[PDB]
């Protein structure tokens, strides 16, 4: 709908905002999965011992 | 190249787009190093034991 109702020069501006938000969300997700996996690893290490 | 084919009022807008990206990339580098150092630290703590 963003494009469907506009030219390229005018749509690229909005699509870059959408891209910025959606990339920020994915970085937040991946950083928290990295922090949460190091906590699961310390627990599996205790289980092995 | 932005300081050679743009006047100062137009080169600010183009320099800020680079500043934002490079800051993002540097800060991603610094987060992943904290997460990797916290893992090297536990290995060295096991080696000391």
Radius of gyration of chain B (CA): 20
Alpha helix stretches (DSSP H) within A1-49: 8-48
A·B CB contacts under 8 A: 9
Taking a C-beta distance cutoff of 8 angstroms, is the pair A20, A28 a contact? no
Residues of B in contact with A35 (CB under 8 A): 35
Measured CA to CA, the distance from residue A8 to residue A2 in angstroms comes to 10
Measured CA to CA, the distance from residue B17 to residue B19 in angstroms comes to 6
Q: What is the resolution of this structure in A?
A: 4.0
The partner residue sitting opposite B35, judged by closest CB among A27, A35, A42, is A35
Per-residue tokens: B7: 């006047």
Measured CA to CA, the distance from residue A43 to residue A48 in angstroms comes to 9
């Amino acid at each position: 709908d963003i494009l469907s109702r506009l030219d390229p020069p005018e749509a690229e501006v909005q699509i870059d905002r959408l891209i910025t938000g959606r990339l920020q969300s994915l970085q937040t997700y991946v950083t928290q999965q990295l922090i949460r996996a190091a906590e699961i690893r310390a627990s599996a290490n205790l289980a092995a011992t």
